[PDB]
Amino acid sequence: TGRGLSFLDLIQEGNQGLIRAVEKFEYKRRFKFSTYATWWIRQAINRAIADQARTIRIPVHMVETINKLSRTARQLQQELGREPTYEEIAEAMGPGWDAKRVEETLKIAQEPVSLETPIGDEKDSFYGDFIPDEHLPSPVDAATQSLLSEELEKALSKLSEREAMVLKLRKGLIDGREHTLEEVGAFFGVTRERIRQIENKALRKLKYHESRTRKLRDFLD
Amino acid sequence: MVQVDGGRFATSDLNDLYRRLINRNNRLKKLLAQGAPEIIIRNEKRMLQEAVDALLDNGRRGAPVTNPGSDRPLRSLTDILSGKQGRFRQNLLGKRVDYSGRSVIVVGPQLKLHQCGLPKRMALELFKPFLLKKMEEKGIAPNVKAARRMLERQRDIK
């Protein structure tokens, strides 16, 4: 009990172990059933505890390493009368273990925390209430992206429709993806050198217009 | 399941409840596949029902399911909906809203009945989009973004 699994869960996993024991048992050895059963029961329970109790699942060997690290650290703290540093644990774990390895192991062993954990005396505060959502774009960012699209359409209309469309196909404003010189050249019916040339002059005219009005400078962050 | 500022993960209890459910269920499927006795399958089924119960309404029947090393009941769907902190009362009939603020009150004697003293900075932040717009309307800024970046720092205010 207390190792991260419910009493009944432990019981059921131990039952699975018992079943394994029954199917693998040989009475010819003149051993009582308890002796051979206990091994498989303990094995199944331990496997369950290792494969379950973590919200983010960790491989069983890794869990073994982590628990070994914990026993080591606890021994060291019992001998030293203080919490061991990373270096002391590293030295105590033998060769292959430096401070960085101990730290990375501990870090990788960090369990998640509940979003419903209260921050206060009353029922009012939840931890998750303080967590900003970074995913959905802010109204400001959205409006700035919109004004960007509009200003780019402003500067692309100052070109001829051909060069504007070549630039638009090359940077992928149309379908969202960038075509090569061969594809825009095959679509416009010219050579790749020619399509790259009109892309060059389009971009250059854009550079001139930008050096002139300076509308697109503020969007560069 | 979200990574906070410190590089640590924070997650909802519904995940633990769902995990309980799935684990007990799968264990039941394997226990059935292997033809375990009754008194085993029975126990498993019972624990499955109690798992589903814990998920849908927790602490409703029997003891509430808790996380390891805590006296705190886990938050189930029923809890999420009902209650003063529940979805309805907290997030539906009422909300936290934008373009708002608060401060201490002080009596203006001079105010006409229809007026209120509003601190400058408060008003600036409250009305900010309008201020950007009227800043682009005049020659104070080339565009919106420029005006906003201009208002961001306090020593840039004029």
């Binding site: 009493f7 009944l8 019981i11 | 008194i39 029975r42 126990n43 019972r46 624990m47 109690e50 029997g62």
Partner: peptide
Amino acid sequence: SDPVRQYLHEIGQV
């Protein structure tokens, strides 16, 4: 009521 007690009873049968 208490699932553990119940299971221990059922086990206590055989």
